[PDB]
Ligand binder design. Structure first.
Ligand SMILES: Nc1nc(=O)c2ncn([C@@H]3O[C@@H]4CO[P@@](O)(=S)O[C@H]4[C@H]3O)c2[nH]1
Ligand SMILES: [Ca+2]
Length: 127
């Protein structure tokens, strides 16, 4: 959350894929977000895993890295920080993780799973 509801709304509204959603849907998404914490060096997403979660960074920074084959060391792609996001295609069921996302310091993310998201957006075309 209640205290953070408005903060969560601001984070959600800043994601371009979400910024046209009805206000009520964004409010309900804010209600179902979970906060998760990670330590420096922890993989938030591991390339090659299958997952169903999308992340918005509320604290800290992460390294996005990617390996071109399983036996090759990954290469650094970019840093993401507060207000940035990653993993969105998992909400559309594209569950194959295509890059690693690794905490570069203490990180907090707001996390939405596909089931919670589909429940809230799946009725828009009906209404
Ligand atoms: N492949 C890739 N190349 C990049 O340059 C890149 N920058 C950010 N990300 C994100 O890392 C996530 C990892 O999980 P997913 O594959 S479900 O989605 C991904 C993206 O959201 C990137 N991914
Ligand atoms: Ca914000």
């Amino acid at each position: 959350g209640l205290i953070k509801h408005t903060e969560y709304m601001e984070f959600l509204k800043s994601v371009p894929t979400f910024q046209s959603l009805p206000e009520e849907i964004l409010s309900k998404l804010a209600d179902v977000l979970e906060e998760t914490h990670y330590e420096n060096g922890e993989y938030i997403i591991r390339q090659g895993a299958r997952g169903d979660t999308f992340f918005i960074i509320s604290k800290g920074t992460v390294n996005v890295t990617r390996e071109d084959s399983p036996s090759e060391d990954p290469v650094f792609l970019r840093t993401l920080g507060k207000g940035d996001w990653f993993g969105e295609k998992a909400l559309q069921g594209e569950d194959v993780r295509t890059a690693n996302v690794i905490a570069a310091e203490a990180v907090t993310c707001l996390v939405i799973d596909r089931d919670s998201f589909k429940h809230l957006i799946g009725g828009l075309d009906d209404v």
